[PDB]
Amino acid sequence: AHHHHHHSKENESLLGITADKITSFADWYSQVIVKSEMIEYYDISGCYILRPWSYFIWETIQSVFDQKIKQHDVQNAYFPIFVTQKKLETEGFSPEVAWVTKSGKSDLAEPIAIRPTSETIMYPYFAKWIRSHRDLPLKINQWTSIVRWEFKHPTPFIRTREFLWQEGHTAHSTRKEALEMVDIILNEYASIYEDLLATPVVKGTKSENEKFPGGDITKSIEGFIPEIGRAVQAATSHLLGQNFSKMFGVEFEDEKGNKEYAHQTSWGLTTRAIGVMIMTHGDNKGLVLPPKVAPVQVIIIPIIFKTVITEEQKKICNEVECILKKAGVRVKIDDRSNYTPGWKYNHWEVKGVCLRFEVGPRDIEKRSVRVVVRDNMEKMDIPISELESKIPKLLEEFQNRLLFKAKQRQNESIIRVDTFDKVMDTLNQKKMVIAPWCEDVSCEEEIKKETARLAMKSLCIPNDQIFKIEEGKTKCFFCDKLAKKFTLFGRSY
Numbered sequence: 001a002h003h004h005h006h007h008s009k010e011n012e013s014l015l016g017i018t019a020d021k022i023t024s025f026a027d028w029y030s031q032v033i034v035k036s037e038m039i040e041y042y043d044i045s046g047c048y049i050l051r052p053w054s055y056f057i058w059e060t061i062q063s064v065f066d067q068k069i070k071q072h073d074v075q076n077a078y079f080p081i082f083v084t085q086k087k088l089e090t091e092g093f094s095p096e097v098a099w100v101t102k103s104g105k106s107d108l109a110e111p112i113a114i115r116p117t118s119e120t121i122m123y124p125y126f127a128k129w130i131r132s133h134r135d136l137p138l139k140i141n142q143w144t145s146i147v148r149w150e151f152k153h154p155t156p157f158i159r160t161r162e163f164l165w166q167e168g169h170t171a172h173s174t175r176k177e178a179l180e181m182v183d184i185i186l187n188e189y190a191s192i193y194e195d196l197l198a199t200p201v202v203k204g205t206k207s208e209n210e211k212f213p214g215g216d217i218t219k220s221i222e223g224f225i226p227e228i229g230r231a232v233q234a235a236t237s238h239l240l241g242q243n244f245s246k247m248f249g250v251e252f253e254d255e256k257g258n259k260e261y262a263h264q265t266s267w268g269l270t271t272r273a274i275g276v277m278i279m280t281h282g283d284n285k286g287l288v289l290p291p292k293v294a295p296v297q298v299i300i301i302p303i304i305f306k307t308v309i310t311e312e313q314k315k316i317c318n319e320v321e322c323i324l325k326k327a328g329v330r331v332k333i334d335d336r337s338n339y340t341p342g343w344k345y346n347h348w349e350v351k352g353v354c355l356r357f358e359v360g361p362r363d364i365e366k367r368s369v370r371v372v373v374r375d376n377m378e379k380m381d382i383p384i385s386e387l388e389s390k391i392p393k394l395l396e397e398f399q400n401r402l403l404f405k406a407k408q409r410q411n412e413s414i415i416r417v418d419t420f421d422k423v424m425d426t427l428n429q430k431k432m433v434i435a436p437w438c439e440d441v442s443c444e445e446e447i448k449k450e451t452a453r454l455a456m457k458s459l460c461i462p463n464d465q466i467f468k469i470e471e472g473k474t475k476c477f478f479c480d481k482l483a484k485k486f487t488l489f490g491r492s493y
């Protein structure tokens, strides 16, 4: 679905994308993020430079999500990047901890860990701040970078040794209020991917074998990349319960005067969202960005070459730019006489600009503009007097079309299998499995073991159970136990 629309002579250049998205996905992903000036590879493995074209999308994700959690009285703070070994020791993987072992030429007697997550940093101070039920709920969030020495092969955005993320940590007086906070954040995470990034995700609950061992319930949104047949956890929201409050002493005096441990939640979203969004919408021409996160929604390209644009040509472009600026549209004019219009067309197509305006003599004469849509090569002529109304509608239609097309690609990637004899062939088709499952830890341990023999794991137990179980008859697709619900399975990042 990547190489359907018309490619121009400049799209077939080396300044375009030469690797096919389906048959050469890894090379396609690298060319798309590099040639669009999103990412620069760094001489330290697993780290990638976030150029402004990609960092804008994170700033938009950060701006939109920060306003969302402020609706629930979540306050932003910043805790140090460092944490002692004693606090950190008591998905914690010791080989992932980046340790500062020297300052200058002086060795540290006790090395200091770089923050892989802030439970150890923050919770000793949650216990210090929380003495009464009146002090609850406490809701803290921080935007910061995280360093984890990932053992698996790094992927830009998806899995980086340094990534930018948001981590919210809340404490409540009741488990019910905490679980409501877990579901609230999960819906906002799903909104970030679907409403902002036009990326479909599946809301659900992690299995006992796949949940965060430090919490009671781990809910998540699962994404999927069909071109490689691997799911990707889009975000996560944990019902920590009292596991962390018991071990850090975060207790409060409830009403009537009894000491009770706090009911905590924690949730996180990283720059991985950008990578999942890129892989979802990008085609063989390069980036395809949702209008809500595209750094430039409209590029105005006057038909000029070598010489300077005429005075009436610059006046029309400024008028169109003024109309689009007043309408809240992010718009820029590319009046570089240095490049042919075809060069600019491919240049802003690789960068994923939603709409391009071609302004030539015929457009000046009619007081109209030639609009070319990025993702489907749709062409139309809009009068200048209609731009204020039509362009916000086109970007709105653009956003809906990306989510709708990405949705039907995800729905066709979910295959129902009721017996294990059809699971392996479904996985080999680069697709997920929705199967009747008993949800036992022992069952998933053998599911991972048997599928690794030809590994498949539970992605999430979806909140929306589209299929029904026979009360007392529907057995697990793998073992002899009765199936509880249907669970989404597949290989993941």
Ligand SMILES: Nc1ncnc2c1ncn2[C@@H]1O[C@H](COP(=O)(O)OP(=O)(O)NP(=O)(O)O)[C@@H](O)[C@H]1O
Pocket (backbone or CB within 6 Å): 091, 148, 150, 157, 158, 159, 160, 161, 163, 232, 233, 234, 235, 236, 268, 269, 270, 271, 272, 493
């Ligand atoms: N190295 C990474 N780079 C970018 N995003 C990441 C990375 N690791 C995790 N994430 C994302 O951040 C979210 C919250 O972090 P976390 O729950 O600690 O992931 P995780 O438990 O390490 N899962 P995983 O590392 O894939 O086994 C995850 O749901 C991922 O979507």
Ligand SMILES: O=C(C[C@H]1NCCC[C@@H]1O)Cn1cnc2cc(Br)c(Cl)cc2c1=O
Pocket (backbone or CB within 6 Å): 088, 091, 092, 093, 094, 096, 097, 116, 117, 118, 119, 148, 167, 168, 212, 236, 266, 267, 268, 269
């Ligand atoms: O980090 C987590 C759980 C939650 N903490 C912050 C909010 C979002 C996030 O899902 C799971 N995790 C993952 N990787 C880790 C790596 C190391 Br090293 C350590 Cl010490 C700890 C962890 C660790 O705790």
Ligand SMILES: [Mg+2]
Pocket (backbone or CB within 6 Å): 091
């Ligand atoms: Mg990890």
Ligand SMILES: [Zn+2]
Pocket (backbone or CB within 6 Å): 437, 438, 439, 440, 443, 476, 477, 478, 479, 480, 481
């Ligand atoms: Zn089973």
